Amino acid sequence: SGTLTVTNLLEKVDDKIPKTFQNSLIHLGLNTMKSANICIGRPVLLTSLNGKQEVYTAWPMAGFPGGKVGLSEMAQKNVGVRPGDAIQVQPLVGAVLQAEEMDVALSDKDMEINEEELTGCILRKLDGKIVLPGNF
Amino acid sequence: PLLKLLPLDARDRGTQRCRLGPAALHALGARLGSAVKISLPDGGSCLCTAWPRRDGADGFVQLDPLCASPGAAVGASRSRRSLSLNRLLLVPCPPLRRVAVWPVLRENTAAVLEAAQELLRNRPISLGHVVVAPPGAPGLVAALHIVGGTPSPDPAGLVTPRTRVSLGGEPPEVPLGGLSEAADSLRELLRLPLRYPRALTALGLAVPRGVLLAGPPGVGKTQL
Amino acid sequence: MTQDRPLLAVQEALKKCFPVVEEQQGLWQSALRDCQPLLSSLSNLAEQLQAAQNLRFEDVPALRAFPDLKERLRRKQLVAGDIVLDKLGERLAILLKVRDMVSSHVERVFQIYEQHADTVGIDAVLQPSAVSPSVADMLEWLQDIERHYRKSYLKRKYLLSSIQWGDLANIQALPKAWDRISKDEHQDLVQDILLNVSFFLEE
Numbered sequence: 001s002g003t004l005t006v007t008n009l010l011e012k013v014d015d016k017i018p019k020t021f022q023n024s025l026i027h028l029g030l031n032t033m034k035s036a037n038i039c040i041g042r043p044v045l046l047t048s049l050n051g052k053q054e055v056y057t058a059w060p061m062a063g064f065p066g067g068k069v070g071l072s073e074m075a076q077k078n079v080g081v082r083p084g085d086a087i088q089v090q091p092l093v094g095a096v097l098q099a100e101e102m103d104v105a106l107s108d109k110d111m112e113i114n115e116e117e118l119t120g121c122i123l124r125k126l127d128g129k130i131v132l133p134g135n136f
Numbered sequence: 137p138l139l140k141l142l143p144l145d146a147r148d149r150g151t152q153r154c155r156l157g158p159a160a161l162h163a164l165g166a167r168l169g170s171a172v173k174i175s176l177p178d179g180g181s182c183l184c185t186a187w188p189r190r191d192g193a194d195g196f197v198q199l200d201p202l203c204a205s206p207g208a209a210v211g212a213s214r215s216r217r218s219l220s221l222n223r224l225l226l227v228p229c230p231p232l233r234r235v236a237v238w239p240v241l242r243e244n245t246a247a248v249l250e251a252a253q254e255l256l257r258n259r260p261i262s263l264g265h266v267v268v269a270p271p272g273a274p275g276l277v278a279a280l281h282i283v284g285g286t287p288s289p290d291p292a293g294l295v296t297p298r299t300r301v302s303l304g305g306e307p308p309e310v311p312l313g314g315l316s317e318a319a320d321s322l323r324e325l326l327r328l329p330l331r332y333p334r335a336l337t338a339l340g341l342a343v344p345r346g347v348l349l350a351g352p353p354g355v356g357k358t359q360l
Numbered sequence: 361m362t363q364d365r366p367l368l369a370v371q372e373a374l375k376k377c378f379p380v381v382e383e384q385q386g387l388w389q390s391a392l393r394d395c396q397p398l399l400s401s402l403s404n405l406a407e408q409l410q411a412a413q414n415l416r417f418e419d420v421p422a423l424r425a426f427p428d429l430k431e432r433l434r435r436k437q438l439v440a441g442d443i444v445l446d447k448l449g450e451r452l453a454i455l456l457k458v459r460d461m462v463s464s465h466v467e468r469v470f471q472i473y474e475q476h477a478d479t480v481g482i483d484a485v486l487q488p489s490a491v492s493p494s495v496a497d498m499l500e501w502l503q504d505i506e507r508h509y510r511k512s513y514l515k516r517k518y519l520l521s522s523i524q525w526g527d528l529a530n531i532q533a534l535p536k537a538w539d540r541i542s543k544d545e546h547q548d549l550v551q552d553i554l555l556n557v558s559f560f561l562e563e
């Protein structure tokens with residue numbers, strides 16, 4: 001009742017996924033998502049065996065082999081996931097609130113960058129992303 | 137019970153929507169879109185529509201003041217004040233048949249009347265209230281002041297697509313001495329090109345229009 | 361059983377309301393795709409008419425055997441301008457019909473909810489599901505669609521009503537103010553709502 005198995009995301013299919021949910025997305029089968037009471041568009045919380053966590057958005061896939069959560073490769077690096085492992089998926093009953101101050105630490109150091117339009121690229125491509133300390 | 141105040145999202149800006157939790161909607165007994173009068177903490181009041189939060193969590197209040205008392209747009213929430221629930225009321229809205237508005241235009245009668253009908257379409261409004269146009273609105277009306285109505289919007293009411301819109305109107309420093317001698321020398325020149333509704337076109341010429349002020353740096357020429 | 365009929369009365373009203381919005385969105389995109397080469401042609405005619413207005417027709421030494429050329433050339437150029445503008449008023453009438461029937465269907469949905477309001481609770485409206493969003497989300501999205509259609513129609517109507525043949529810098533700037541109207545809106549609004557409600561519609 002919560003332990004599923006990871007797989008890669010079905011390719012193509014980019015004309016049936018709304019544009020606001022592009023970079024924050026997992027895919028699930030309809031009977032699996034009906035079983036563990038997850039709704040469409042609501043966030044879910046993912047916990048691995050190492051105790052690393054992530055908050056993403058569910059989409060009805062209508063296809064993925066029943067019992068298979070689909071994640072991208074950045075998610076698999078961020079939680080720490082090889083394809084063929086176990087993961088814990090839960091729905092969120094609490095509250096999500098608007099952030100106002102986010103201390104980010106740049107990794108490495110490329111050309112020091114125009115800061116304000118780097119902030120414009122951050123706030124344009126990442127919108128509605130639920131943040132945790134330690135995520136990339 | 138105390139509820140917090142939060143700044144509004146980018147989808148509630150200019151929509152007249154109040155975002156409440158489910159326990160406050162159970163205590164108010166309101167449906168979706170019903171009229172809620174909010175008595176503000178720093179004086180004044182506003183009128184809003186009740187819509188639920190997506191999260192389902194109770195203990196938070198957001199509000200967008202569009203129909204406001206004049207000089208009561210104090211809904212900025214930097215200091216995070218808390219509102220009590222005893223200050224929100226469920227207000228019945230009968231439909232109206234005639235309104236009376238006074239428009240504040242941006243810097244003919246039919247375009248101003250068409251822009252008033254278009255702004256006030258399907259909204260709850262009260263008496264002595266300013267309706268502010270949203271940013272990016274088409275047209276020329278920037279604000280409306282509500283003056284009167286025949287089913288009497290003192291406990292407020294709803295404009296309908298078949299109501300009538302009519303236009304009435306009733307809107308209810310250092311002196312520096314020492315330059316007195318030269319202050320009126322300026323007026324004996326400049327008063328005559330200030331009382332000119334093309335009257336000097338009709339009879340006369342134009343006294344000069346090109347004055348020059350001179351003096352030492354510090355006698356207060358710019359303040360004159 | 362007693363409360364079974366009120367909620368399914370609102371749900372078939374939403375099921376009737378959404379494909380109407382899909383059909384008029386297709387009509388709106390066809391009219392907006394038709395409007396652009398007419399505006400480019402009107403900018404070309406404004407260039408030709410300003411270049412004719414700059415010039416004197418007696419100092420040119422070849423053009424003395426035809427001493428009436430200016431009003432004949434001006435008459436033809438302005439007969440082509442009237443053709444383009446009547447074609448443009450036809451596109452504006454198509455956008456008006458789209459706006460009117462979308463607003464009537466949304467008002468019908470809110471009227472049937474107001475009739476069946478107090479029987480169903482708040483908690484039946486707020487409940488989501490694994491195939492469908494809640495009733496309150498879909499009503500809010502319908503209200504957003506109606507407000508977007510009203511605002512875009514009046515912005516395009518006032519831009520089309522400010523065209524005069526005594527000021528010609530306006531006619532050469534019209535082309536980019538139309539693209540600035542189309543770039544200021546919420547991008548991909550109707551398609552995201554229809555993709556969210558398609559699982560509720562097909563079931």
Ligand SMILES: Nc1ncnc2c1ncn2[C@@H]1O[C@H](COP(=O)(O)OP(=O)(O)OP(=O)(O)O)[C@@H](O)[C@H]1O
Binds near residue numbers: 310312352358359
């Ligand atoms: N009656 C007065 N006559 C002269 N100065 C005054 C008088 N009353 C106040 N002041 C002082 O003069 C200041 C006004 O300075 P102001 O900027 O007008 O100077 P200015 O003569 O225009 O300067 P500048 O020559 O640099 O343009 C006031 O802020 C005040 O400190």
